[PDB]
């Protein structure tokens, strides 16, 4: 557990519809939602592989006995019930563990996205605490495109952000 999905980000965005994890900006040019497509694509590939691996791992009639073969009939019944119990247990356990692993995977993705944006903005922005940063400089759509790509220019706004800080 990484404390992001139900942690410092306390709610999901129905507005976000282009991806699983993403970003919301509020410039002077307008508001918007925009998903992180690289993270979403990687997550989709990994989870598809997970489902396929669960599927690929899994892949009769009865016998009749007369009244003088009760021992062999009981042996057959024991074999059938034992295998049934083992396979039921395996299926339940696999689903239960895989679900937690998936949820933790999503939590890790969200937290890593937050970490990546933070290590890029540094002191030019302020952590509000709910999941967002308030920039100390007035930078436009090109700014948030750069932040999303990962090509933010800290020296470019370092001086401008210092007076407002």
């Amino acid at each position, epitope marked *: 557990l990484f404390g992001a999905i139900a942690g410092f980000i306390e709610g999901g965005w129905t507005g976000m*519809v*282009d*991806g699983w994890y993403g970003y919301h900006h509020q410039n002077e040019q307008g508001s918007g939602y*925009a998903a992180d497509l690289k993270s979403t*694509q990687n997550a*989709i590939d990994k989870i*598809t592989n997970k489902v396929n691996s669960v599927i690929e791992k899994m892949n009769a009639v009865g016998k009749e006995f007369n009244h003088l073969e009760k021992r062999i009939e009981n042996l057959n019944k024991k074999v059938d019930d034992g295998f049934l119990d083992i396979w039921t247990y395996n299926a339940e356990l696999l689903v239960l563990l895989e679900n937690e692993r998936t949820l933790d995977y999503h939590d890790s993705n969200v937290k890593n996205l937050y970490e990546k944006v933070r290590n890029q903005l540094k002191n030019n922005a302020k952590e509000i605490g709910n999941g967002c940063f308030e920039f100390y400089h007035k930078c436009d759509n090109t700014c948030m*495109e750069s932040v999303k790509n990962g090509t933010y220019d800290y020296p470019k706004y370092s001086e401008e952000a210092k007076l407002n800080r």
Partner: antibody, heavy 115, light 103 residues
Framework: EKLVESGGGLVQPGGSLRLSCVGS????????VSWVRQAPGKGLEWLAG??????????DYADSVKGRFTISRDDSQNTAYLQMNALRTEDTARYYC?????????????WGPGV | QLTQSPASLAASLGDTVSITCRAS??????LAWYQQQPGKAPKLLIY???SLQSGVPSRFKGSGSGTDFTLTISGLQAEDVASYYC?????????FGAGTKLE
């Protein structure tokens, strides 16, 4: 995985035709199914797209076929339907069904052979 | 919305080929390039405007962010003679480019 298109053929002008795209697998509710067509001597043309059941925008249509074509989905039978109404001569083409996973911003890399 | 250039382009083996796409408005990296051979289903080459699909040779590269995109084929081979289409995946009425034929 795989996608198979069925329900094509010859239709009189002004007629109707229902095309079906059936997928193999267990993850079909994840699919985001889109229809493309190629007229003889023209390029690819995106017609319609049906989203997943738990989503805001459920269907989307190109302007050239909006109001005439209707896209629909049946996840229990693993099928996506394109209902074409008031068919014209210019609708003669090869129809293909492609699928993206979960979102329309992801790879549309599973295509059907076409009808 | 999507203008693809040139409509046709004849090149020789071993050459370098550039196909350009221009969008009416800003689509942020949501472009895909498809190679189609006659009568067959299109085959994806580059998604996210720069990501190379598995199984596609590294001859194909893609570039562009906002409204100008480029598909570059370095070391053209005889099996690269096909049509090339550009797909946007940003605005609700999704669409293809006009198409480029390579000879």
């Amino acid at each position: 995985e795989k996608l198979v298109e069925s329900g094509g053929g010859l239709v009189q002008p002004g007629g109707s035709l229902r095309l079906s795209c059936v997928g193999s697998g267990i993850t079909f509710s994840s699919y985001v199914v889109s229809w493309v067509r190629q007229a003889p001597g023209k390029g690819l043309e995106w017609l319609a797209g049906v989203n997943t059941v738990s989503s805001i925008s459920r269907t989307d249509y190109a302007d050239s076929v909006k109001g005439r074509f209707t896209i629909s989905r049946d996840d229990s039978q693993n099928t996506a339907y394109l209902q074409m109404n008031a068919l014209r001569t210019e609708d003669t083409a090869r129809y293909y069904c492609a699928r993206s996973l979960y979102f329309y911003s992801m790879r549309m890399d599973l295509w059907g052979p076409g009808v | 919305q999507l203008t693809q250039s040139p409509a046709s382009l004849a090149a020789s083996l071993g050459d370098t080929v550039s196909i350009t796409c221009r969008a009416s408005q800003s689509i942020s990296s949501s472009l895909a390039w498809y190679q189609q051979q006659p009568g067959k289903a299109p085959k994806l080459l580059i998604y996210a405007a720069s990501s190379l699909q598995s199984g596609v040779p590294s001859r194909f590269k893609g570039s562009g962010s906002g409204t100008d995109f480029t598909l570059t084929i370095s070391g053209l081979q005889a099996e690269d003679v096909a049509s090339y289409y550009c797909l946007q995946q940003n605005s609700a009425p999704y669409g293809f480019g006009a198409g480029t034929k390579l000879e």
